[PDB]
Coordinates of C-alpha atoms in Angstrom, one line a residue:
Chain A
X313 CA 38.0 6.3 20.7
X314 CA 35.5 4.1 18.9
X315 CA 36.7 2.4 15.8
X316 CA 33.1 2.8 14.0
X317 CA 29.8 4.6 14.5
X318 CA 27.1 2.8 16.3
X319 CA 24.5 4.6 14.3
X320 CA 22.9 4.9 11.7
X321 CA 24.8 2.0 10.2
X322 CA 23.8 2.3 6.6
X323 CA 24.4 -1.2 5.8
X324 CA 21.9 -2.4 8.3
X325 CA 19.3 0.0 7.3
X326 CA 19.6 -0.6 3.7
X327 CA 18.7 -4.5 4.1
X328 CA 16.0 -3.9 6.5
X329 CA 14.4 -1.1 4.4
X330 CA 15.0 -2.9 1.2
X331 CA 13.4 -6.2 2.4
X332 CA 10.4 -4.3 3.6
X333 CA 10.4 -2.3 0.2
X334 CA 10.8 -5.7 -1.4
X335 CA 7.9 -7.2 0.5
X336 CA 5.4 -4.5 -0.6
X337 CA 6.9 -4.6 -4.1
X338 CA 6.1 -8.3 -4.3
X339 CA 2.6 -7.4 -3.3
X340 CA 2.1 -4.7 -6.1
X341 CA 3.3 -7.2 -8.6
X342 CA 1.2 -10.0 -7.0
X343 CA -1.9 -7.9 -7.2
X344 CA -1.8 -6.9 -10.8
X345 CA -1.9 -10.6 -12.0
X346 CA -5.9 -11.1 -11.4
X347 CA -6.4 -7.5 -12.5
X348 CA -6.0 -8.6 -16.1
Chain B
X105 CA 43.2 -14.3 35.6
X106 CA 41.8 -10.8 36.0
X107 CA 44.9 -9.5 34.2
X108 CA 44.3 -12.2 31.3
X109 CA 40.7 -11.1 30.7
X110 CA 41.3 -7.4 30.8
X111 CA 41.0 -5.4 27.5
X112 CA 43.9 -3.1 28.5
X113 CA 46.4 -6.0 28.8
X114 CA 45.5 -7.2 25.4
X115 CA 45.9 -3.6 24.0
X116 CA 49.1 -2.9 25.7
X117 CA 50.5 -6.4 24.6
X118 CA 49.5 -5.8 20.9
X119 CA 50.9 -2.3 20.8
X120 CA 54.3 -3.8 21.9
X121 CA 54.6 -7.0 19.8
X122 CA 56.3 -7.0 16.4
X123 CA 53.3 -8.8 14.8
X124 CA 51.4 -5.6 14.9
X125 CA 54.1 -3.0 14.4
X126 CA 55.1 -4.5 10.9
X127 CA 51.5 -4.6 9.9
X128 CA 50.9 -0.8 10.4
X129 CA 49.7 1.1 7.3
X130 CA 50.5 4.6 8.5
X131 CA 46.9 5.7 8.6
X132 CA 45.5 6.4 12.1
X133 CA 41.9 5.0 11.3
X134 CA 43.3 1.9 9.6
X135 CA 45.9 1.2 12.5
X136 CA 43.0 1.7 15.0
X137 CA 40.7 -0.7 13.2
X138 CA 43.6 -3.2 13.0
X139 CA 44.3 -3.0 16.6
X140 CA 40.8 -3.4 17.6
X141 CA 40.3 -6.3 15.2
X142 CA 43.4 -8.0 16.8
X143 CA 42.0 -7.2 20.3
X144 CA 39.2 -9.8 19.7
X145 CA 41.6 -12.3 18.4
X146 CA 42.3 -13.2 22.0
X147 CA 39.5 -14.8 23.8
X148 CA 39.3 -15.9 27.5
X149 CA 36.9 -18.7 28.3
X150 CA 36.5 -18.9 32.1
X151 CA 36.4 -22.3 33.8
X152 CA 33.9 -24.0 36.1
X153 CA 35.0 -26.1 39.1
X154 CA 31.6 -27.8 39.1
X155 CA 32.1 -29.3 35.6
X156 CA 35.9 -29.7 36.3
Chain C
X17 CA -7.2 -16.0 -0.5
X18 CA -7.6 -13.6 -3.6
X19 CA -5.3 -10.9 -2.1
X20 CA -5.0 -9.6 -5.7
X21 CA -8.7 -9.0 -6.0
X22 CA -8.8 -7.5 -2.3
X23 CA -6.3 -4.8 -3.2
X24 CA -8.8 -3.4 -5.9
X25 CA -11.5 -3.3 -3.2
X26 CA -9.6 -0.9 -0.9
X27 CA -8.2 1.1 -3.9
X28 CA -11.8 1.8 -5.0
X29 CA -12.9 2.3 -1.5
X30 CA -9.9 4.4 -0.4
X31 CA -12.4 7.3 0.1
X32 CA -14.4 5.3 2.7
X33 CA -11.3 4.2 4.7
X34 CA -9.8 7.7 4.8
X35 CA -13.3 9.4 5.2
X36 CA -14.1 7.5 8.7
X37 CA -10.7 6.2 9.7
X38 CA -9.5 9.8 10.3
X39 CA -12.8 10.4 12.1
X40 CA -11.8 8.1 14.8
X41 CA -8.7 10.1 15.2
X42 CA -10.6 13.3 15.5
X43 CA -13.1 11.5 18.0
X44 CA -10.0 10.6 20.3
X45 CA -8.3 14.0 19.8
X46 CA -11.1 15.9 21.7
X47 CA -10.8 13.2 24.4
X48 CA -7.3 14.3 25.1
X49 CA -8.6 17.9 26.0
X50 CA -11.2 16.2 28.1
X51 CA -8.6 14.3 30.4
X52 CA -6.3 15.4 33.0

């Protein structure tokens, strides 16, 4: 019997999607500097 | 060598030794996790005759 | 590279990108029914 699930491995998904969400989040904050 | 490198031998050895029985918690999932963790504690590195 | 200014260009021109960008998908959609 497997010790742990092979998917969807929440921890791996949180970091990958958080980093992607962080990258676009940086762009949103980046693009508002010259808007003022 | 085949017996040394086999997963089954490691599992049956760990299940028999006293190093693991005294570390049992009583929860099936925890015991399985501990056994699987201690399986990887034994690593077999095959040798090469070319490099002696 | 003024990415901050660039984001306002597509934000104001979002109608143009959506207007004809989806047209390309519609163009290829009929191509599916035109093929084996």
